[PDB]
DNA sequence: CGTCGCCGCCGCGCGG
DNA sequence: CGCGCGGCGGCGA
């Protein structure tokens, strides 16, 4: 097989590499890598190396990596550019793997672990590590085994061995309900003392050294706790055994306020699942406890135990160990669903970077572009220093707040990357500038043609047309990968709807789910078999369709994020190819493209319907337009439609056969106007929205920019079995809005759009009546706990103190002098509740760490002093009034002349 | 060391 | 609660 790397590190003048050899064996080597860097040379001397601008370069081969670094410093002191890849391990990887990497994941050792630490005096700080580690569960992907290390004897209690028999039993039998599919995969090792547990763990680590190391909070907690505990007991050298090259670094993480120290383990790639989840999941959660994320992702019940975790080992060691094993497995289950490890490996090997560098798109694109340029013997420019400067972004149209009955949306495919490709925007393709007219002049086609030679953007930039730049070239490859996965995702989604439709008539029989590839549209023979299946088999198929859809979602959305991040990188000072002329050329072209096509769509539809000056486009943001279709529906008449699906088909056909061709003509004209290299403005229909036929639903509404709701029947070719709410910006979508409030507001909007004013008033009245019975967590707001110390004046709110920080300060005063109470962590999430006047907490609100029940010390007093009236008015009534005034509805029945009879 | 636009809640200081 | 400005948090693209 083709060799591939596992990990790479620079240590002094050595590269340390772990890799899989041609036989599929893991090896390690130390190479005294001789790096090359480059300097511009005279035009007359013969060379095969050229910088991106076509300037001749001479190669400088160095005796070692330290020489290369010192040369860079001398070139600065002289005042001359030192070209080439200064991250020597990326250059090593490029030299060693001078081909497209085919990797085999089954050869890569992925480790998932978590630890337990009993602590009677508060949170066990990793940097101190003064408490014994009493449990480690470490899953190995190559062995497919959970290795459990269990401490029987501790200064905090002597315990009996964990029983695998009781662990396997149901909770109703007094067992722990450890899933039966992992019971046979557990290798349990009890220890008489902590020293022997840790020594054995290190020996185990040595035999089965992680390549990818993951888990939940392993970077912030598990890794540093284990490193420091071993350091405190045995000394630094023993702790350094967690690195296969015995080198570690104790380094700070800096964003802004405060600092925390993480441990870098050389020769290991740490991918903390929390960080993977935060970057790749496209959620913002109220809580990041594993309980919370597990319940959200997998629909599994929280891990249930009595008393504080500080007493769980002592009171119920059996459950303590089982819950440690389950915690590890739950991260595995999330990953089997989300597939973030697979994504990381894919992106990592594609760019030829350390796998952990997937968190950094700048690093990712730096390596992609370097490998692409190196292939042609081209030399990358030196990184320069730039001051941060603001620059303009997208156009957002001010909507008229209103209800909107029939709506069709259109959207440009992968806009910013397509602008890059269409215009040919790259560092080496800059051709010059033209004199700029006001943007509205380009939008209205009255400004003079920018160039008869080069490809232009309305910001004044001009680009070569003879050849593709490296940025368009490399962004195209990833875009094409994105497109494949999106296709798989949408087909899985369409297949899902076929199963949903069939579930309305489930046949009664014992059968099995069909063995099908959900990434491809179901054939006719498959569709017919589904129609004859039982609810049980259909449900399993729906689950599988939905898992296939999620996998597709991960692959496509994160490839989209990567290509969009290349646009973003052009506007970040740390990017090698930072250039505000290029970033602005993209965003300005975008503003033109949107407003240009608004004009065209309006002009076209006014021609179709026979009017003048009527605005059909009601809204647009960046790359999408929202078109009012009332008049199109009205031109045939609502009475001519059999049912909802009929007018939906009509609009679908109208958009595809009439509007899209016109849209294309308008964009082809724009391409010619700007003299662009290639026409790539592809605007397809996205949503078809409206009320159910014969109902009093309003269909949709806008309250303002970025704030709207639509009742959607068809989304990019997916015809839904049941109409689906597209809600953007509104309180239903914010992680800060209480869960019960999100749910209620969503049902209010559902009723408005699908059923009408009367239905909405019924629901509101009922919600107002029953509100006070809602569980306190379901009605707590959520916020992020930033800058606590800034507004802390002696435990009391300082000037300008934010509402949620006031609540934290209240909490801190309430729990002061108690080691056992959960501390609020700087930068983490908190639940927030209003407090009635005259409460014993001495303030108007209280906040506590999210994902948790509030400590039993203050729970009783919070529930008694919770201000339901303020809660209802602020998080529910105010937003609903906002919705209803925008939609011209009343959420309370106004009096009428009829209130006079019967 | 991906980006900008723009919403609503809040504290503050008005607003005769 | 009437208003706008700046801080903040959090989305929508
Ligand atoms: C979501 C997102 C968009 N944008 C910018 C770039 C996008 O091209 C533009 C429009 O966003 P979107 O319409 O959300 O996405 P898209 O057009 O790039 O991809 P799709 O084919 O799925 O429609 O907004 C970012 O810069 N960063 C982001 O994270
Ligand atoms: Ca735990
Ligand atoms: Ca788009
Ligand atoms: Ca689309
Ligand atoms: Ca059937
Ligand atoms: Ca869009």
Helix content: 40-55%
In this entry the ligands are: thymidine-5'-triphosphate, calcium ion
CATH topology of the largest domain: Palm domain of DNA polymerase
Tell me what the CATH architecture of the largest domain is: Alpha-Beta Complex
User: Could you say which overall geometry the principal axes of the C-alpha atoms support?
Assistant: globular
Give the beta-strand count.
33
Q: Structural class of the secondary structure composition? A: alpha+beta
Cα distance spanning the termini: 88 Å
Rg for CA atoms: 31 Å
State the fourth-level CATH superfamily of the largest domain. Answer: B family DNA polymerase, palm domain
The helix count comes to 27
Give a quick account of the main beta sheet: strands, pairing sense, barrel closure. 8 strands, antiparallel
How many domain regions? 6
CATH class of the largest domain: Alpha Beta
How large is the share of residues in beta strands? 15-25%
Pfam family, one: DNA_pol_B
Protein name: DNA-directed DNA polymerase
Catalytic activity: DNA(n) + a 2'-deoxyribonucleoside 5'-triphosphate = DNA(n+1) + diphosphate
GO biological process, one term: DNA-templated DNA replication
